[PDB]
């Protein structure tokens, strides 16, 4: 008979996939029953059938996790690479901690900046920076935040900088928050699923099941708009090509089409958007530039990009929408230039295809039909990334799809916990809960709070950010405890104050000038992920010290090692001291991570890490305690802010996940009472809602939007009730979502002004005469139907913005601008303004930009379903699935170059080259653009010089070092290359 | 001598364990007039035992072992938050779940460990 079932007596552990943001549930199996004498060893992993999002499924990455956990390249011991050396030397943990602490203290004492030139205390350290792990837990994230800021660091970023930064920069100004608005299962309720600016079937496969459910079982139309015919296109009803970097033209064309054909949800637009608000008379746009442009500083004076004010100081309105200055009429005028012919001429999209897309999207302007957009990097990684997203968000507002089940903007997050690290503020000028570090111009607490607490711009609005002081003081109480009091302004001056944003491109420009001494790379592989790899390696080579914390060997940890063409360096010429510290992976700790739908999910430990590997919190603690002890006995610069930071854990060298998660949730530090004299919480208890946070020092929380995640009722992130009473796919009992378990953001907009559902078959909330109740937690207060209170409660005007006032760097309305490296060498809409006029481009990088005469083809980089960045190539199962590096080109380009399918080729740019196998296919076709034939060369990003897949080249060897004008997110999706037979 | 068991010829373990824990025979109040226990309920601490006939317990140091919160002797939480090997959630120890006797002496006169 068959072999016996191999898991019958194994230990079963629940955990979550460590790769993308879908957050699939896992059931891991270990050899051993937990007895102390048996050392657990995971030997099989499969899906959790009860998880509502994945329902047992796992894509090739999740399904192959065993080979990552047990990779031959797992790190085992602390290792050190000496200056000019070509080998690693194993050292003890104590040696690593002491050496690192000594290096850090010497650098901090030499370069710490206590006061700026204007005499303000700024307590900042800029000569050592850090990259944080979006693949690690929220608890690791908070410890990292405390570690970095208490030391005064401002060059602190996580993957968000090179990923969804543009989304936050655009969706927050448009809707009030930067997060994905709905959730995975909810996609099944859509009538139209739009995959543009993303490739969900390859980048979020298990989550994509719900788009297939919408298509197959809800009769939805699936549309894919991409320069390549992808695996998502394989199952699409409609496929339309588009040239990389032209989305704003295509989307603005859709806006023009909707307005011209009156295919909008008029009542939704009139009441829920700022369509009726009047704009200042001095606002204008002409020939590619908005009013207020300063050509020398290459920035805009945004004074004119604002509303006209009435006698009470609120925005003036014209409910009839006839006034020439209302947002609605100005929007109509702005997009009038984007005709179908213009779309075809710039995007290359045939008019017949564009028409099909317009018609289908237009069909969802009906109140009971919705479109949901699924996007990611195809839109974010451009110099106009934030504006790409602005245009789509505007479309969803015109169609009345925000706040609707089956609608919304599903900005699909990347790393398993990039959402959590963004929430916790591991970005240069951020603090947890979307709070902001003080700028150096804000000399006192009062000035700081006033700058961050917005005044309402229309009467009768929730304007919830008015509560900023309560969140800030509570954060300070969590950080400093008894040391933070009213008398010393809650420790205000201990936080580092910024003079500017220290984004990664800027910081590496500084590194190249010799201004950076050390760098930490915690679960981040910049040699593989940063743009212009040859320059990146050159920059890192100038560092005096580097500390890598990871569960795997990474290209960054071995940047000093010669790997032939893949990494042609001379170890003897690189003086950097490199420390490589072995950490745990997802399966070796308990903790929480936030998925794309804002679900904070708890997971449990399945085995101990291999060799001497330690968990991330232990590694930080080891370095931190060694460093603070040096300060205790030697003194030094910036002693007080460092020593005042709390590290209140039962075992200081081993902070536990539950301790940190509870800190994030928050506590009542004194008994708390409501206005009627009723006790809401007792001293020492966990808080149940951020509504209970106060600005008087009686409450603490290190992440206010997480209050409710772990209460006196227990760890809500561990909830496993998959009940869906409404049938809409909303499972309030599984895990816990922020804010306050609201699964669909902006849900008040799922109903009209009288509280009646736009679609009676999709009711999310309803009015019972005294409060809002329903199938989801209301993302609203208790304003009765008919009142002026808007549904976008984080907006000072309570509306979705069609006109983004003074929030965007390059304009209150999106506008087409070509990529820095463009195949046309001009912009057909306005030749006088070719690329984004507010883009920052350092002189050194401008010299490394190519032109179409030498690099005629559009280069773009993307993913394949089988691999996750340069991480999975360390796992055998995935290496077997896609073993060797390739690039994709059309049959037309291959024929012109004499390249046969499977032949070896050399793809190059102004910055470098890679060699690979050519995948010649009709899935890539040239487009007719502005009278030329434009070809695209596709470059997947999964291979490199470490791993078990066949050795290859870092794709970023080709990419330009320039980014979005708002977030400085690199333009990895549209540049120029050349190709030759190899 | 009482032998108050539902089946006199087969006393059950839970019946006797509850007798050992103890009961409030009348509603009990603290000095501030606050109800500490209702007539018929299991006592939560020997601190609530009285010398006036209103409380019963056949083993005072065992009061807290089986309360209105349930059989604490059946608790199976092996959590050790401090790392010192103290597991307050596994079973129940007398007196009042104190695992290390004389622990005030683990600190000096000023309360410092
Ligand atoms: N399989 C797998 N899954 C992943 C990851 C992985 O490494 N592998 N990484 C995770 C992370 S960190 C993230 S951020 C997501 C991102 O996931 P996505 O952004 O969906 O994925 P990408 O593969 O980067 O590419 C997006 C698509 O845009 C197309 N494209 C290129 N230029 C443009 C353009 O200018 N306009 C439009 N409209 N399309 C363009 C590309 O051909 C590509 O198919 O993936 C996550 N999921
Ligand atoms: N050409 C081009 N460039 C890109 C992109 C693109 O589309 N094209 N996309 C960009 C985006 S969106 C992203 S997110 C980046 C990602 O690029 P990176 O995040 O740098 O790359 P990864 O390979 O995902 O590796 C991160 C590390 O996390 C480690 N890790 C796993 N679990 C833990 C843990 O618990 N603790 C620690 N300390 N480490 C852990 C993994 O082993 C891995 O080495 O690439 C970006 N760069
Ligand atoms: S990579 Fe994403 S889609 Fe695949 S199993 Fe992991 S979480 Fe699910
Ligand atoms: Mo990403």
**Contact A873 CB / ligand 2 (< 6 Å):** no
Comparing CA positions, the residue from A399, A394, A385 lying closest to residue A198 is A385
Q: Nearest 5 degrees, angle CA A720-CA A726-CA A731?
A: 20
First-to-last alpha carbon distance for chain A, in angstroms, is 53
User: Which residue has the least CA distance to atom 44 on ligand 2?
Assistant: A523
Pick the atom of ligand 2 nearest to A414's CA: 14
- Give the C-alpha distances (Å, rounded to integers) separating A427 from A19, A113, A121, A491, A502: 21, 20, 21, 21, 9
Who contacts A425 (Cβ-Cβ below 8 Å, separation ≥6)? A145, A431, A432, A433, A434, A435
Q: Which atom of ligand 2 is least distant from the CA of A871?
A: 23
A654 touches chain B (CB under 8 A): yes
**Chain A residues touching residue B82 (CB < 8 angstroms):** 650-651
- d(Cα A796, Cα A772) in Å, to the nearest integer? 21
CA pair distance A621, A727, nearest whole angstrom: 47
Q: What is chain A's alpha carbon radius of gyration, rounded to the nearest angstrom?
A: 27
Check if the beta carbon of residue A545 is closer than 8 Å to that of residue A44. no
Distance A162 CA to ligand 4 centre (A): 7
Distance CA A730, CA A52 (A): 9
Ligand 1 neighbourhood includes A461 CB (under 6 angstroms): no
Q: What domains appear along chain A, each with residue ranges and CATH number?
A: 1-73+275-326+417-498+650-742 (no CATH), 74-161+499-649 (3.40.50.740), 162-274+327-416+743-806 (3.40.228.10), 807-982 (2.40.40.20)
Residues A668/A627, Cβ–Cβ less than 8 Å: no
Estimate the crossing angle of helix A247-260 against helix A385-399, to 10 degrees.
20
**3-state secondary structure (DSSP) of residue A861:** strand
d(CA A529, CA A540): 14
The kind and range of the H/E element at A603 are: strand A599-603
Q: Is A237 exposed, middle or buried (0-12, 13-18, 19+ CB in 10 A)?
A: middle
Q: What is the DSSP letter of A694?
A: -
Instruction: Kindly state the tokens that stand for A465.
Output: 């950010």
CB A869 less than 6 A from any atom of ligand 3: no
Sign for the CA dihedral angle at A336, A338, A341, A345 comes to positive
Distance from CA of B42 to the nearest CA of A (A): 24
Q: Which of A406, A433, A491 is nearest to A145 (CA)?
A: A433
| Contact by Cβ (8 Å): A893, A86 | no
A655/chain B closest Cα distance in angstroms: 10
Q: C-alpha A778: how far from its chain's center?
A: 25
The SS3 call for residue A468 is helix
From ligand 2's centre to the CA of A422, what distance in Å? 15
Determine the straight-line distance between the first and last CA of chain B, rounded to whole angstroms: 49
φ, ψ (nearest 5 deg) of residue A658: -65, -35
Q: Are residues A452 and A436 in contact, defined by beta-carbon separation less than 8 angstroms?
A: yes
Structure tokens at A261: 């054909």
- Chain breaks of chain A after residues with C–N above 2.5 Å: none
Query: Tokens standing for A148?
Result: 């970095």
How does DSSP classify residue A736?
A: E
- Residue A585 assigned as binding residue: no
d(CA A278, CA A155): 40
A869 Cβ inside 6 Å of ligand 1: yes
Instruction: Characterise A481 by phi-psi region: left (phi > 0), alpha (psi -120 to 50), beta (else).
Output: left
Parallel, antiparallel, or unpaired for β A121-124 and A113-115? antiparallel
Pairwise CB contact (< 8 Å): B82 & A654: no
Question: Annotated binding residue at A163?
Answer: yes
Q: Determine whether A50 is exposed, middle or buried from the number of CB atoms within 10 Å of its CB (0-12, 13-18, 19+).
A: middle
Question: Which residues are A153's β-sheet partners?
Answer: A125
Q: Indicate the helix (H) or strand (E) that contains A647.
A: none
User: Which of A19, A133, A228 for mutating ligand 2's site (highest number of atoms within 8 Å of CB)?
Assistant: A133
Q: Are A537 and A527 in contact (CB under 8 A)?
A: yes
CA A372/CA A215 separation, integer angstroms: 12
- The residues with which A518 forms a beta bridge, in sequence order, are A128, A545
Q: Is the peptide bond before A506 cis (omega within 30 degrees of 0)?
A: no
Contact A577, A82 (CB under 8 A): yes
Our CA-based measurement puts residue A654 at a distance from the nearest CA of chain B, in whole angstroms, of 9
Chain-centroid distance of CA A658 in Å reads: 25
- What ligand has the least distance to the C-alpha of A203? 1
CA torsion A415-A421-A422-A423 (nearest 10°) is 120
Q: Say whether A17 counts as a known binding-site residue.
A: yes
CA–CA distance, A805 with A307 (Å, rounded to integer): 7
* Residue B84 C-alpha, separation from nearest chain A C-alpha, in angstroms: 10
User: Alpha-carbon dihedral of residues A193, A199, A203, A205, nearest 10 degrees?
Assistant: 40
Mutational test site, ligand 1, from A246, A252, A378, A859, max ligand atoms within 8 Å of CB: A378
Q: Please say whether the beta carbons of A125 and A108 come within 8 A.
A: yes
Cα distance between residue B62 and residue B97, in whole Å: 10
H runs (alpha helix) in A635-698: 639-644, 657-665
From residue A614, alpha-carbon distances to A77, A581, A586 in Å are: 9, 8, 12
d(CA A827, CA A830): 6
Question: How far is residue A962's CA from residue A913's CA, in Å, rounded to a whole number?
Answer: 18
Q: Which residues of A touch B83 (CB under 8 A)?
A: 650-651, 654
| Ligand 3 atom nearest residue A19's Cα | 1
Query: In Å, what resolution does this model reach?
Result: 1.6
Instruction: Indicate if ligand 2 lies below 6 Å from the C-beta of A556.
Output: no
Strands, E assignment, A879-972: 886-889, 904-908, 913-920, 927-929, 932-934, 936-940
- At A108, give phi and psi (nearest 5°): -65, -40
A521 labelled binding-site residue: no
Phi, psi angles (nearest 5°) of residue A642: -70, -50
Measure the CA angle with vertex A398, ends A396 and A403; round to 5°: 50
Using a CB–CB cutoff of 8 Å, tell me whether A650 touches chain B: yes
Instruction: List the alpha helices (DSSP H) in A736-884.
Output: 843-846, 876-881
Query: Determined by which method?
Result: X-ray
């Amino acid at each position: 008979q068959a072999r016996n079932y191999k898991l019958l007596r194994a230990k079963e552990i629940r955990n979550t996939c460590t790769y993308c943001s879908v957050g699939c549930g896992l059931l891991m199996y270990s050899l051993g029953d937990g007895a102390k004498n048996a050392r657990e060893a995971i030997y099989h992993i499969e899906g959790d059938p009860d998880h509502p999002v994945s329902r047992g499924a796992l894509c090739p990455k999740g399904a192959g996790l065993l080979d990552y956990v047990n990779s031959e390249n797992r790190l085992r011991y602390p290792e050190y690479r000496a200056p000019g050396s070509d080998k690693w030397q194993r050292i003890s943990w104590e040696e690593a901690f002491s050496r690192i602490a000594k290096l850090m203290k010497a650098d901090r004492d030499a370069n710490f900046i206590e006061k700026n030139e204007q005499g303000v205390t700024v307590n900042r350290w800029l000569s050592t920076g850090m990259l944080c792990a979006s693949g690690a837990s929220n608890e690791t994230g908070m410890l990292t935040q405390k570690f970095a800021r208490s030391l005064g660091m401002l060059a602190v970023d996580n993957q968000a900088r090179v990923x969804h930064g543009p989304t936050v920069a655009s969706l927050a100004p448009t809707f009030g928050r930067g997060a994905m608005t709905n959730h995975w299962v909810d996609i099944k309720n859509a009538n139209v699923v739009m995959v543009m600016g993303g490739n969900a079937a390859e980048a979020h496969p298990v989550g994509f099941r719900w788009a297939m459910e919408a298509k197959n079982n809800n009769d939805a139309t699936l549309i894919v708009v991409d320069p390549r015919f992808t695996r998502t296109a394989s199952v699409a009803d409609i496929y339309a090509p588009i040239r990389s970097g032209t989305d704003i033209t295509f989307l603005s064309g859709v806006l023009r089409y909707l307005i011209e054909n009156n295919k909008i949800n008029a009542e939704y637009v009139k009441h829920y958007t700022n369509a009726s608000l009047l704009v200042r008379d001095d606002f204008a746009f002409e020939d590619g530039l908005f009013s207020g442009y300063d050509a020398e500083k290459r920035q805009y004076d945004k004074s004119s990009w604002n509303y006209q004010l009435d006698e009470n100081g609120y925005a003036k309105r014209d409910e009839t929408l006839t006034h020439p200055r209302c947002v609605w009429n100005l929007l109509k005028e702005h997009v009038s230039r984007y005709t179908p012919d213009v779309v075809e001429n710039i995007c290359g999209t045939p008019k017949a295809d564009f028409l099909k897309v317009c018609e289908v999207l237009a069909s969802t302007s009906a109140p009971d039909r919705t479109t949901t957009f699924l996007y990611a990097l195809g839109w974010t990684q451009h110099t106009v990334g934030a504006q790409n997203i602005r245009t789509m968000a505007m479309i969803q507002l015109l169609l009345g799809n925000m706040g609707m089940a089956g609608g919304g903007v599903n900005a699909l997050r990347g790393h398993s916990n990039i959402q959590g690290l963004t929430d916790l503020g591991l970005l240069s000028t951020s603090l947890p809960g979307y709070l902001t570090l003080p700028s150096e111009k804000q000399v006192d607490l009062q000035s700081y709070l006033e700058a961050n607490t917005p005044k309402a711009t229309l009467a009768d609005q929730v304007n919830y950010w008015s509560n900023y002081p309560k969140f800030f003081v509570s954060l300070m109480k969590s950080f400093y405890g008894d040391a933070a009091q009213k008398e010393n302004n809650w420790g205000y001056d201990w936080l580092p104050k910024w003079d500017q944003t220290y984004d990664v491109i800027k910081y590496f420009n500084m590194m190249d000038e010799g201004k950076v001494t050390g760098y930490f790379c915690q679960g981040f592989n910049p040699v593989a992920s940063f743009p212009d790899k040859n320059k990146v390696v050159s920059c890192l080579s100038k560092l005096k010290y580097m500390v890598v914390i990871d569960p795997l060997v990474t290209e960054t940890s071995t940047f000093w090692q010669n790997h032939g063409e893949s990494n042609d360096v001379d170890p003897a010429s690189i003086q950097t001291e490199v420390f490589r510290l072995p950490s745990t992976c997802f399966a070796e700790e308990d903790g929480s991570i936030a998925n794309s739908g804002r679900w904070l999910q708890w997971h449990w430990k399945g085995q101990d890490a291999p060799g001497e590997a330690r968990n991330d919190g232990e590694i930080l603690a080891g370095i931190y305690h060694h460093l603070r002890e040096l300060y205790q006995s030697e003194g030094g610069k910036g002693v007080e802010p460092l020593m005042k930071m709390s590290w209140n854990y039962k075992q200081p060298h081993e902070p536990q996940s539950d301790e940190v998660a509870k800190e994030n949730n928050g506590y009542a530090l004194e008994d708390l009472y409501d206005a009627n004299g009723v006790l809401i919480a007792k001293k020492g208890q966990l808080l149940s809602s951020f509504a209970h946070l106060r600005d008087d020092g009686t409450t603490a929380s290190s992440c206010w939007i997480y209050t409710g995640s772990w209460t006196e009722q227990g760890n809500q992130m561990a909830n496993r009730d998959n009940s869906d009473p409404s049938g809409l796919g909303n499972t309030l009992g599984w895990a816990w979502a922020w804010p306050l378990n609201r699964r669909v953001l902006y849900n008040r907009a799922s109903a009209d002004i009288n509280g009646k559902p736009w679609d009676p078959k999709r009711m999310l909330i309803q009015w019972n005469g005294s409060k809002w109740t329903g199938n989801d937690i209301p993302d609203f207060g208790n304003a009765a139907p008919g009142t002026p209170t808007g549904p976008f409660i984080m907006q000072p005007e309570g509306m979705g913005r069609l006109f983004a006032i003074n929030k965007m760097a390059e304009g209150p309305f999106p506008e087409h601008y070509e990529p820095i490296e463009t195949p046309l060498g001009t912009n057909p809409l306005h030749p006088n303004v070719v690329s984004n006029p507010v883009v920052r481009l350092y002189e050194q990088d401008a010299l490394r930009m190519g032109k179409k005469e030498q690099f005629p083809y559009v280069g773009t980089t993307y993913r394949l379903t089988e691999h996750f960045h340069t991480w999975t190539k360390h796992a055998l199962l995935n290496a077997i699935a896609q073993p060797e590096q390739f690039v994709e080109i059309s049959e037309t380009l291959a024929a012109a170059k004499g390249i046969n399918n499977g032949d070896r080729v050399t793809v190059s740019s102004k910055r470098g080259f890679i060699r690979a196998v050519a995948v010649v296919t009709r899935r890539l076709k040239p487009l007719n653009v502005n009278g030329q034939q434009v070809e695209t060369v596709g470059i997947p990003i999964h291979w490199g010089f470490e791993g078990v897949a066949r050795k290859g080249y870092i794709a970023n060897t080709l990419t330009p070092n320039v980014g979005d004008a708002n977030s400085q997110t690199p333009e990895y999706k549209a540049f120029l290359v050349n190709i030759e037979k190899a």
